[PDB]
Amino acid sequence: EGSMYALAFDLKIEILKKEYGEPYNKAYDDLRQELELLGFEWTQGSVYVNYSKENTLAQVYKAINKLSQIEWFKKSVRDIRAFKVEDFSDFTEIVKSLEHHHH
Amino acid sequence: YKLILGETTTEAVDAATAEKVFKQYANDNDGEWTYDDATKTFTVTEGSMYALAFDLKIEILKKEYGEPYNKAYDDLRQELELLGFEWTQGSVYVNYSKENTLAQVYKAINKLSQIEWFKKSVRDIRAFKVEDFSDFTEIVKSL
């Protein structure tokens, strides 16, 4: 069936603070649950990946919609992107760490 | 020997000799080739974009690289930049190239694999095959 999608974004802390208030880091906890629910999994600081293969495109439109309802997000967001991911590979994680070079 | 590009077949002597055919074939009609012998199914996909995303344990960085650590991210952006991957909002790098990009991805992994502190600090690092990407910033803001 269809392909997978990645969701990535960045917030302007300066204004994030005002439209949310400290501790502002709690804001990322919020978005997390919301995005988790739509099938998007937390991969690393503001980059979510829904690994589903069904009607995923639909999930992005849903996620964008939800975010659009969260005032503090609309006002602080610097950028928000959606990548169509045809295939991935963690190869690195382990290779990166273990692999040693004898010169 | 099926050839996923649509499709095609051939009655070559073996998987090895079969590739030569499909090779010239799609070359006269060009990308990354894969092969599944257990099913005699060759598959090829032309130029593609790749994303490269990584995450480091800040706890370790401060010990392996030093404090302040932000420089380390710059160091990284530059090595990655030289390899064709450009920084994109957040610690996500995208190589837009579309040709032999996969090689660049491996070129990048290899470099990173040889940088001690990075080896020591990575929490996770992966690459994505990106077909298309859309920017929703402006829409997300509309009322």
Side-chain angles (χ1 to χ4, degrees):
Chain A
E1 289 285 285
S3 72
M4 310 172 276
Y5 285 77
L7 207 61
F9 65 86
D10 197 72
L11 301 186
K12 285 136 154 281
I13 277 56
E14 328 85 48
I15 75 197
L16 184 272
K17 282 167 168 285
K18 309 170 193 173
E19 309 316 70
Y20 192 79
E22 288 97 306
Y24 78 74
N25 288 296
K26 181 184 299 178
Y28 291 107
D29 302 302
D30 301 30
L31 301 172
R32 183 170 181 170
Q33 292 179 58
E34 294 261 294
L35 294 175
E36 223 83 49
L37 301 177
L38 290 164
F40 290 96
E41 297 169 52
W42 162 290
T43 279
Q44 55 186 66
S46 290
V47 187
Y48 297 74
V49 190
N50 182 316
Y51 287 105
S52 174
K53 292 77 172 183
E54 64 141 295
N55 295 309
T56 302
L57 183 75
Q59 299 311 109
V60 198
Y61 281 95
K62 288 173 180 174
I64 256 57
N65 204 102
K66 196 59 189 176
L67 282 168
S68 174
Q69 313 294 182
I70 310 181
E71 267 303 68
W72 68 255
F73 182 82
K74 300 172 66 66
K75 275 175 294 182
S76 296
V77 71
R78 169 171 281 128
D79 179 275
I80 164 67
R81 288 173 192 295
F83 293 81
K84 182 171 182 198
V85 188
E86 180 185 297
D87 160 61
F88 76 85
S89 51
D90 182 66
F91 73 125
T92 317
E93 196 188 62
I94 181 64
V95 177
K96 185 51 54 291
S97 292
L98 178 55
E99 172 112 308
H100 271 65
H101 300 263
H102 293 53
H103 299 59
Chain B
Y1 290 106
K2 188 185 304 300
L3 175 65
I4 298 174
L5 303 159
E7 304 176 59
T8 300
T9 68
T10 305
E11 302 300 302
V13 296
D14 68 302
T17 297
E19 178 179 297
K20 188 176 182 179
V21 175
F22 304 117
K23 271 293 184 61
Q24 193 62 59
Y25 178 66
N27 186 297
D28 298 301
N29 278 296
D30 179 56
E32 303 282 358
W33 296 75
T34 130
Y35 177 62
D36 188 285
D37 184 66
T39 63
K40 278 61 182 181
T41 301
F42 273 102
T43 57
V44 53
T45 301
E46 303 181 302
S48 177
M49 298 185 285
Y50 290 88
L52 206 48
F54 72 78
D55 186 48
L56 326 161
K57 308 166 180 176
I58 305 304
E59 315 73 59
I60 302 182
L61 237 198
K62 314 172 80 166
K63 303 177 178 178
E64 299 302 303
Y65 183 84
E67 310 186 75
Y69 50 88
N70 60 295
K71 191 185 175 299
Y73 288 90
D74 287 307
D75 283 40
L76 286 186
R77 192 179 334 124
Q78 285 191 287
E79 308 287 330
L80 288 175
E81 258 173 45
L82 268 179
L83 296 183
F85 298 81
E86 25 194 310
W87 157 277
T88 208
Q89 229 64 186
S91 180
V92 172
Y93 294 83
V94 187
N95 185 318
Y96 298 109
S97 176
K98 266 182 174 182
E99 55 187 303
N100 306 300
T101 311
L102 185 62
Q104 286 289 170
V105 185
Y106 286 126
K107 296 172 73 177
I109 297 303
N110 191 240
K111 185 91 176 191
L112 287 175
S113 80
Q114 292 181 290
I115 305 181
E116 245 295 349
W117 68 262
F118 186 97
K119 295 170 69 63
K120 292 278 182 54
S121 314
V122 242
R123 180 181 303 175
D124 166 90
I125 165 162
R126 57 269 308 299
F128 306 91
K129 197 164 181 174
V130 181
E131 276 301 306
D132 183 9
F133 57 100
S134 298
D135 175 32
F136 286 78
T137 304
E138 304 313 314
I139 71 91
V140 159
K141 289 176 171 294
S142 71
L143 310 78

